[PDB]
Amino acid sequence: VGACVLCNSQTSLRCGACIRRPFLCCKCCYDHVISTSHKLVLSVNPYVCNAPGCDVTDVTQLYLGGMSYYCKSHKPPISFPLCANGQVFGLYKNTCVGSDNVTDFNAIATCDWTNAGDYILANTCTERLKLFAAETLKATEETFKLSYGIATVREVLSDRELHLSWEVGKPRPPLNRNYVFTGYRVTKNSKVQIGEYTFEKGAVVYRGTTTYKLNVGDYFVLTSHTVMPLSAPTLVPQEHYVRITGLYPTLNISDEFSSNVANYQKVGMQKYSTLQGPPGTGKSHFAIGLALYYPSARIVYTACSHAAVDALCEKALKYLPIDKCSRIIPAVECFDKFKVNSTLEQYVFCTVNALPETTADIVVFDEISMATNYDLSVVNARLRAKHYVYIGDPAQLPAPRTLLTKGTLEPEYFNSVCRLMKTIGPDMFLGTCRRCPAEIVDTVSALVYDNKLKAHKDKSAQCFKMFYKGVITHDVSSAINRPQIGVVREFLTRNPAWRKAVFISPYNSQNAVASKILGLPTQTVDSSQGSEYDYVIFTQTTETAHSCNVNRFNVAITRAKVGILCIMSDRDLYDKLQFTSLEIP
Amino acid sequence: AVGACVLCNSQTSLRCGACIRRPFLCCKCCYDHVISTSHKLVLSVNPYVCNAPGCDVTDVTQLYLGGMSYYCKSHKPPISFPLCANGQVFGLYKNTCVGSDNVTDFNAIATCDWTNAGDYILANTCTERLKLFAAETLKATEETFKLSYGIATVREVLSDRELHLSWEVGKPRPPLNRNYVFTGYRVTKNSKVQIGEYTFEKGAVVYRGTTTYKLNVGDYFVLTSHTVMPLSAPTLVPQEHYVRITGLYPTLNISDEFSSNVANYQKVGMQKYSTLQGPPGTGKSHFAIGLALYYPS
Amino acid sequence: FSSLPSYAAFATAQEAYEQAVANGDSEVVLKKLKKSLNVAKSEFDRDAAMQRKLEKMADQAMTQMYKQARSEDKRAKVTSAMQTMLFTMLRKLDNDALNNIINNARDGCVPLNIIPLTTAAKLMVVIPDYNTYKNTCDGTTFTYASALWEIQQVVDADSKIVQLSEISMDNSPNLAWPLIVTALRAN
Amino acid sequence: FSSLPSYAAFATAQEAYEQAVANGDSEVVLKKLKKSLNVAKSEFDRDAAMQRKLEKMADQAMTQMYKQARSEDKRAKVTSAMQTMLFTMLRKLDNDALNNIINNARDGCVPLNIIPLTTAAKLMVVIPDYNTYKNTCDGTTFTYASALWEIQQVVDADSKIVQLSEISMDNSPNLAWPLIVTALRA
Amino acid sequence: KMSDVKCTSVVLLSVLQQLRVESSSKLWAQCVQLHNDILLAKDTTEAFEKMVSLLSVLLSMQGAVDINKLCE
Amino acid sequence: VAFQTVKPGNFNKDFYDFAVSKGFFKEGSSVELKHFFFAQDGNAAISDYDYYRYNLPTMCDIRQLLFVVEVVDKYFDCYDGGCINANQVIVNNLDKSAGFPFNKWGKARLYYDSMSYEDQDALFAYTKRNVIPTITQMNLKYAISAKNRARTVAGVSICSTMTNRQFHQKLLKSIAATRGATVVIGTSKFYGGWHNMLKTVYSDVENPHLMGWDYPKCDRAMPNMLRIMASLVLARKHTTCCSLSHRFYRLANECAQVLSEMVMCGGSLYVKPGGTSSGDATTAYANSVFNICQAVTANVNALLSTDGNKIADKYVRNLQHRLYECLYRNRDVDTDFVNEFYAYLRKHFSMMILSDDAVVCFNSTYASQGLVASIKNFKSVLYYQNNVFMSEAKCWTETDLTKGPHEFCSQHTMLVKQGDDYVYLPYPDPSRILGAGCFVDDIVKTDGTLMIERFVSLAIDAYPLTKHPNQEYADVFHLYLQYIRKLHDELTGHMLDMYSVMLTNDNTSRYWEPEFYEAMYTPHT
RNA sequence: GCGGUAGUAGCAUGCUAGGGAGCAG
RNA sequence: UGACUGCUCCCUAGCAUGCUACUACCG
Numbered sequence A: 001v002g003a004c005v006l007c008n009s010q011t012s013l014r015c016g017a018c019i020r021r022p023f024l025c026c027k028c029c030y031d032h033v034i035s036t037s038h039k040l041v042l043s044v045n046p047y048v049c050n051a052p053g054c055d056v057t058d059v060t061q062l063y064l065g066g067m068s069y070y071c072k073s074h075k076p077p078i079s080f081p082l083c084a085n086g087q088v089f090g091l092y093k094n095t096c097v098g099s100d101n102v103t104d105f106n107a108i109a110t111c112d113w114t115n116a117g118d119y120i121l122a123n124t125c126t127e128r129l130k131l132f133a134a135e136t137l138k139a140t141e142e143t144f145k146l147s148y149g150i151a152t153v154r155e156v157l158s159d160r161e162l163h164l165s166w167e168v169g170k171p172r173p174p175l176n177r178n179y180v181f182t183g184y185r186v187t188k189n190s191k192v193q194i195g196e197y198t199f200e201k202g203a204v205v206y207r208g209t210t211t212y213k214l215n216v217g218d219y220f221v222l223t224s225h226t227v228m229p230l231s232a233p234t235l236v237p238q239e240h241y242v243r244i245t246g247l248y249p250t251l252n253i254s255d256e257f258s259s260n261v262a263n264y265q266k267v268g269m270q271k272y273s274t275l276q277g278p279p280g281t282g283k284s285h286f287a288i289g290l291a292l293y294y295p296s297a298r299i300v301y302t303a304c305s306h307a308a309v310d311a312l313c314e315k316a317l318k319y320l321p322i323d324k325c326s327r328i329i330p331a332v333e334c335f336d337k338f339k340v341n342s343t344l345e346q347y348v349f350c351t352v353n354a355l356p357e358t359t360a361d362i363v364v365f366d367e368i369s370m371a372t373n374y375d376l377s378v379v380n381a382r383l384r385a386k387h388y389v390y391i392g393d394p395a396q397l398p399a400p401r402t403l404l405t406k407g408t409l410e411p412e413y414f415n416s417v418c419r420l421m422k423t424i425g426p427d428m429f430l431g432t433c434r435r436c437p438a439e440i441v442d443t444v445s446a447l448v449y450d451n452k453l454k455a456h457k458d459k460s461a462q463c464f465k466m467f468y469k470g471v472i473t474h475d476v477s478s479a480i481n482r483p484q485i486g487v488v489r490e491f492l493t494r495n496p497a498w499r500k501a502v503f504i505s506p507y508n509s510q511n512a513v514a515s516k517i518l519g520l521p522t523q524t525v526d527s528s529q530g531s532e533y534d535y536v537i538f539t540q541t542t543e544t545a546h547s548c549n550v551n552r553f554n555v556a557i558t559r560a561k562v563g564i565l566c567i568m569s570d571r572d573l574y575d576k577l578q579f580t581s582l583e584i585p
Numbered sequence B: 001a002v003g004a005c006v007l008c009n010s011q012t013s014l015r016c017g018a019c020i021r022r023p024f025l026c027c028k029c030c031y032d033h034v035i036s037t038s039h040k041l042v043l044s045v046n047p048y049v050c051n052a053p054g055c056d057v058t059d060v061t062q063l064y065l066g067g068m069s070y071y072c073k074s075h076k077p078p079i080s081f082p083l084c085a086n087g088q089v090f091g092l093y094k095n096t097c098v099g100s101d102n103v104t105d106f107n108a109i110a111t112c113d114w115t116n117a118g119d120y121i122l123a124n125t126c127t128e129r130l131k132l133f134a135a136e137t138l139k140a141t142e143e144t145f146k147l148s149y150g151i152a153t154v155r156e157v158l159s160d161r162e163l164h165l166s167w168e169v170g171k172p173r174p175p176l177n178r179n180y181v182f183t184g185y186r187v188t189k190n191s192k193v194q195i196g197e198y199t200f201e202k203g204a205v206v207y208r209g210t211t212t213y214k215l216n217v218g219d220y221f222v223l224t225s226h227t228v229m230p231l232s233a234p235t236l237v238p239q240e241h242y243v244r245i246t247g248l249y250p251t252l253n254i255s256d257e258f259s260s261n262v263a264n265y266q267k268v269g270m271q272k273y274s275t276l277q278g279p280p281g282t283g284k285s286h287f288a289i290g291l292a293l294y295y296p297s
Numbered sequence C: 001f002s003s004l005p006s007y008a009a010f011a012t013a014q015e016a017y018e019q020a021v022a023n024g025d026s027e028v029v030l031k032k033l034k035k036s037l038n039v040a041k042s043e044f045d046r047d048a049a050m051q052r053k054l055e056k057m058a059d060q061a062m063t064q065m066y067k068q069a070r071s072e073d074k075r076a077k078v079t080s081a082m083q084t085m086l087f088t089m090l091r092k093l094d095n096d097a098l099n100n101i102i103n104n105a106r107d108g109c110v111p112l113n114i115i116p117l118t119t120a121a122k123l124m125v126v127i128p129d130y131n132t133y134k135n136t137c138d139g140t141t142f143t144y145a146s147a148l149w150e151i152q153q154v155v156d157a158d159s160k161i162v163q164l165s166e167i168s169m170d171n172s173p174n175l176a177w178p179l180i181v182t183a184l185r186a187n
Numbered sequence D: 001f002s003s004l005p006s007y008a009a010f011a012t013a014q015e016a017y018e019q020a021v022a023n024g025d026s027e028v029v030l031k032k033l034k035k036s037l038n039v040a041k042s043e044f045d046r047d048a049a050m051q052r053k054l055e056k057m058a059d060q061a062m063t064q065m066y067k068q069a070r071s072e073d074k075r076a077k078v079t080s081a082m083q084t085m086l087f088t089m090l091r092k093l094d095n096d097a098l099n100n101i102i103n104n105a106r107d108g109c110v111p112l113n114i115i116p117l118t119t120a121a122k123l124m125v126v127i128p129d130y131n132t133y134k135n136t137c138d139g140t141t142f143t144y145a146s147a148l149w150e151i152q153q154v155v156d157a158d159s160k161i162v163q164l165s166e167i168s169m170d171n172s173p174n175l176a177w178p179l180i181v182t183a184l185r186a
Numbered sequence E: 001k002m003s004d005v006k007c008t009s010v011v012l013l014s015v016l017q018q019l020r021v022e023s024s025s026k027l028w029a030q031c032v033q034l035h036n037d038i039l040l041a042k043d044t045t046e047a048f049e050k051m052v053s054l055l056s057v058l059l060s061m062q063g064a065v066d067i068n069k070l071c072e
Numbered sequence F: 001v002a003f004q005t006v007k008p009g010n011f012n013k014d015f016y017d018f019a020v021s022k023g024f025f026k027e028g029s030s031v032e033l034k035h036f037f038f039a040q041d042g043n044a045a046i047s048d049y050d051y052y053r054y055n056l057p058t059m060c061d062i063r064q065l066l067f068v069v070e071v072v073d074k075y076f077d078c079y080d081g082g083c084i085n086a087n088q089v090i091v092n093n094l095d096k097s098a099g100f101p102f103n104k105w106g107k108a109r110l111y112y113d114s115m116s117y118e119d120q121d122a123l124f125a126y127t128k129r130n131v132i133p134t135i136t137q138m139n140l141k142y143a144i145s146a147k148n149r150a151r152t153v154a155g156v157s158i159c160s161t162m163t164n165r166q167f168h169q170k171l172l173k174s175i176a177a178t179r180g181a182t183v184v185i186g187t188s189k190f191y192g193g194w195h196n197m198l199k200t201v202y203s204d205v206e207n208p209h210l211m212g213w214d215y216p217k218c219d220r221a222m223p224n225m226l227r228i229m230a231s232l233v234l235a236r237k238h239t240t241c242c243s244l245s246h247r248f249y250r251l252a253n254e255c256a257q258v259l260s261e262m263v264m265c266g267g268s269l270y271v272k273p274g275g276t277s278s279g280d281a282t283t284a285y286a287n288s289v290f291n292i293c294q295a296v297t298a299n300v301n302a303l304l305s306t307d308g309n310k311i312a313d314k315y316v317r318n319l320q321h322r323l324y325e326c327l328y329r330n331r332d333v334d335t336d337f338v339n340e341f342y343a344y345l346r347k348h349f350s351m352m353i354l355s356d357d358a359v360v361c362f363n364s365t366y367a368s369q370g371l372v373a374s375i376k377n378f379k380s381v382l383y384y385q386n387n388v389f390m391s392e393a394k395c396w397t398e399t400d401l402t403k404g405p406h407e408f409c410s411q412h413t414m415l416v417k418q419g420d421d422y423v424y425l426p427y428p429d430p431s432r433i434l435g436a437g438c439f440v441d442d443i444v445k446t447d448g449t450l451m452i453e454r455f456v457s458l459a460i461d462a463y464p465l466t467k468h469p470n471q472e473y474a475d476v477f478h479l480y481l482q483y484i485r486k487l488h489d490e491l492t493g494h495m496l497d498m499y500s501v502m503l504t505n506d507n508t509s510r511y512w513e514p515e516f517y518e519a520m521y522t523p524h525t
Numbered sequence G: 001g002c003g004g005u006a007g008u009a010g011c012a013u014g015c016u017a018g019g020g021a022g023c024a025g
Numbered sequence H: 001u002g003a004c005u006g007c008u009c010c011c012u013a014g015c016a017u018g019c020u021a022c023u024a025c026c027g
């Protein structure tokens, strides 16, 4: 019994056929029911014919017996149709305001999430629509993952390998670690305790995070949770203060981050600022500068992971005293230098996973592009702070959309705040290119970055250009090409100093074929930023919309301090990139 | 108490009473079965018969709904309601009824007394729940067959491998050999214990008892029967041939004693079922033991 | 009620009545075509208002036999439950120690109160205070009912284990005090 | 029941009967409008009978489901209703011995066991800093729950005994501060 | 005024009970004893001391955040 | 082992605040709170079962018990009993527990549904040739009371109740449907039931005093011989339906099931030594038979233990002489003297008996001379025939009949003026009513608007307090009336601010004026 | 001008059944 | 985990019966 979405009037009905079942208002509920197959509605009891053993379950299909609801095939002579009057029968039948055009709401509800139009809906919607949308995505995707087999390790041969089958009738989960399993073992009766695993090109290659050795009958599935509803908005209705009052102006400063202090000064004069954070532009350095500028701040460092907030904790105690940092790791092995399980902490780093709900000082959010509207409202649902900052950039990396089928969504509508730096403009920027030199940086500036990032350093001609083609042939959930893999060593051979690099590749099983040829380590394309060498070899091995789109392996090209490799078999952006070209042997 | 009818698969509660096996029948579908036979008694949670104290009427359409009861016209209260009407016999789930336009297939199986080869042309060239009903009707009526015959009393004992044996009254006699193996049991003063597995042949009565035993006076035999209960799965699943023999274990080494065997197994893992042409002594008993080594898993 | 023999008769009676009334011919027109309609309340007199009373009785009877079908399914379920309880509790019966005491009875009847006494393989003593623990379950083994039992697990009111070293005198006030000492018949 | 069609027919019939009895008209022609009028409450007072039934049937179903909703959201907030009620009645009691321990608890000094009542038994209280030690502990006496307790043990958080006059101000950033005072009732 | 004490002792034992205190047999025994001795008292100055002793059982846990609930 | 506790009651703070708004609970007032929900710790179940240690093997004076049983049976001639078929039994509330182990699979409804009338009748006729020992659970009660002693009832298995009902229900329901008798089970106290009961018990006794006693631990100290006698008296109506072996085997089933049964307390089976199981099929009537037995034997002891030479009424002397002969000299019943002693008792010692609660109107000048039972006689009788000491602090006596029983079924009696004549009204204990208002299981208690039907009944029971001379007592009833008014006109307010529609009409103003409650104590209905 | 039956609505009493609650031993 | 009874109030349903009015047919 709460307030309906489209009305905010206190109601008692919840659309039954609807996935997440939000509270709906009598007139507003009727509007939702008139345009869909969402034709079942639950009140304190479900609106279904309770004549013993019936079948009817549509709402208008029923009439109010006295203590019951019946179909016409059951209704007593004294009946009263539930759905009538343009207003469905429920509590608070008087306080109903509706919305004239709710096909916005019905469209979200009737949205099965297949096309990019679905996420144009998810963002270009209105608010409680926005939380309903993100939560519907999550719900239907954790229902997605379990339409698949039970990964039974049913023989064990060697280590790093398994003999593995699955359940019946179900297609199969993909190849790598965005879909990390977490199996659990049985005894005679019930289910207890294996761990975090994923299965890749073998023969089944499993990359278990923790130490364990598996036995017979050992099974795995992507164990799921219960996504419960959200509360706070994705972002508060923010505004810029008149003076930075209540915030502590410090006397002394470090000009290691002279690109930082003019950036913080109005941030205390304002609620939120999402920053233009190009890769390695001192963005992880950025939030640590304010840490010293305002050491009096309970400043909220959050990211998509303690693999991402990992980077926020990289220079944590290296810059701040020790006992003033803390991270809540729930009962996952990542950084553990801190004191753990202390929320009342001057500096609390964490992930959207499990920082408990409090009130703090200034929010600093890494990973804004890949995280969406769901966890966007999480930190503010977590926490009502002084002021807000999001570190990162939609110029990095979206999320993997398990159900988006037709035509990947813009970089620009990643989330409700991502449009803002493309409709309001960048609140901050950092062009301090500590990492890549004049090699790549402006060629990424003429890409999407406003001609905006300057040269760092000379151009030592170490990031490379290769004009190739290759031949690809498909398999389950990868794509394998050795005409370019053959080019890889062919590239890597004429100087053995080549091969001090990390292999970059989209279809990371193409490294499961390459690792046996070179011994070279693997680079995940999307989970890459934050990690890099000056030397990285990259076989894009595909030119499709999966592959050479604008801002995906964009994160892979900028991995080099000075010397990356790009066998651009694509004509997608090769027409731009300004690097050293040679003949192809 | 309540399941899905054969000819309809809708959820019904009506079982043809005069019918031998009594399968669940659907209201319209049950009426179709009742209109063409003498299967004119139908049981619901209670039997549809006139419960006026001490009546005789038992046909279905012969009855009307008298409140808490079912009556004949000779008993019906002024306020009645004929049970069998509307082209739909009165039972639970009277709405979900689909029927089959030509159920004389079903009636034919039910009215089949199993005398001619036409009976088993029915039993096979039928449809499916028809098929299980058919086989089960055969078995039922044949275990009712065997006991239309006398009680094989060994009433004198002369020598071994011989008996003095008579039977009960009015009944013809079971045949001569061991497809009809008896399993008699002995009495004391009151009830019926153990004897064993026996059959009686040309003597003077030659008995070929499987186990060791020596019989006494009054010793009787009949072909003791069981209770054939219904049957679920189909005779054979809707089968299909896989795309690779996945999930099955390809072995490296093989025995060419059965070189007539390995090419035979290879697609069998690429397929659900294979019934084999097995002529007598063609390594057929050898055949299944070859895969035993080929796929020891 | 539209599909009955009386509805067509009403339609024809009223078609004729209003036709001849718009004609407005005679007083016999209104008289007969208003006395025939008045057999129009004899028309769908009950061909629509006593049967409707059956659409009551049939509904009620169907509901009652619905209920009775359930009542007969619950019965079979509870029967299965009772009998599986019996057949799962007998398999604990320990059938050599109790076949031996029964065969010594003169007629086969033994008091019930001695069956767990003479043939149970597990004892559970409940002890309120330490002083009682001293006169009974002292040491790692004790004797009771003319048999010798060896202690195993000892738990307190919160069902957590207690090592036999803690049941001292002065340590007793820190124990949830109705200890449950379970023991096994020794041989 | 004013806004239904039968009311209009009834108004017409009653106007007709008024014209009749006011004109002193006929015997059978004014017998027209009650064999065609008292029928106008034969199908006005019935259509306006069943809908007047549904009127309160709906309301007695709505109030039933309202009471169900209230009772199902009342037994799902007990954990908090109970605590807020308890603390309202507590601050309403206005007792010094209770307010003392509640204020202490709201800042820091929670006990570690049931406060004993005899002039004997031991009480163990957690003192979290020094400022707090000032207000309660003055030398050898401990004032807590409106009573006096001679201190016998004060021990730091790393379990190391710390005798008394060691404790003062700038010599307090010396000890793991969740101290644990033992004391005995006066 | 004693009636206020008895009613608030009822409420106190209820909130202790739903804090799962009855999973510690001796603690629940002492709380039950104090609660039943408050309901039977006849002079308000011993009910008050058993009430502070009973409330200390709640103040000694870490389940009820106290400062937030003294919002005054 | 399982350790079962008892929770505290929920506080209804709104009713309490309202009560102190109307000026209640002020220091030094007479009406104060004494009934609460007392909580109990783990070892409260068994520490209560252990009270069966008060049941000792008692041998009875057989030649006196064999006469008292005739007199007590004479007290039960007005009724009729016998066996009934399975389709004649009546079971109010089929959804109650079915004992052990049946409570694993469903309530009593499941077992009354799954067995056809023929199965039930076969089961019943089985227990006339066999003994079915059963188990009994022991359950703690969760109810308001004035003392912190735990309470406990005996949940008897369905297999025992199902058959005891068919054995006893005809007589049990012929007892509860008779007016003007000695056993007053079934007689309501409303519509002038109380006045009729008291005017019946004050039949014509010449120097009437009223007397009431108390059985300490009545259910756990009752000797087994008296339980057996009670059941044998209840089974004296089966002289045509049952044969002799059938009657013995039913008695044996009764003993094996509700006398010396196996009690399942905690999670363990113990033996019950004796005394009544308080939750069996015939408790409230076996207790009445036992009550009458003890009163009769108190009279026998009081008349036999009197110096015969000092009695002046030469009819009572001959009655004493004949009584001794009939006890210790005769061997078969003497129906004429049984009738004569029963007549003497009904003349000089009239009783009103509920299941171990009793009122007696007795001839004062006879009890003064030891010709009927006084209270010392009851003390002696319970001492030697019941193994309890009855202190005279629980037994009351009253010498003015115009203020009736000092107590009976926990009600006091007031002689008030109704209409034109004076009637007897039963008023309760104000603390009880206030306590039922303040303390309750949550939602039943804390929010009234969900259940005003509660306060209406509580005000029904609290009405006669309006006629009390004390004034706080009347204020209890008026407080309840004003609280009902507040509840109602705030329910409509809530469902108006939750709405725009509310009560077009109600007629519930009757619930906050006394004419609705007054009517429940005037005789028409 | 009356009777009767049939209908319908209103109203009452009673009985059964179902549910919610209160008190008593 | 909730016993056996007894009484009482409130709500709903059903049926019959009973009472009254409106309309209809026939005598």
Ligand SMILES: [Zn+2]
Pocket: A015, A016, A017, A018, A019, A032, A038, A109
């Ligand atoms: Zn919906």
Ligand SMILES: [Zn+2]
Pocket: A049, A050, A051, A054, A055, A056, A070, A071, A072, A073, A074
């Ligand atoms: Zn329906």
Ligand SMILES: [Zn+2]
Pocket: B016, B017, B018, B019, B020, B033, B039, B110
């Ligand atoms: Zn058939």
Ligand SMILES: [Zn+2]
Pocket: B050, B051, B052, B055, B056, B057, B071, B072, B073, B074, B075
């Ligand atoms: Zn018949």
Ligand SMILES: [Zn+2]
Pocket: F082, F083, F167, F238, F241, F242
């Ligand atoms: Zn009998």
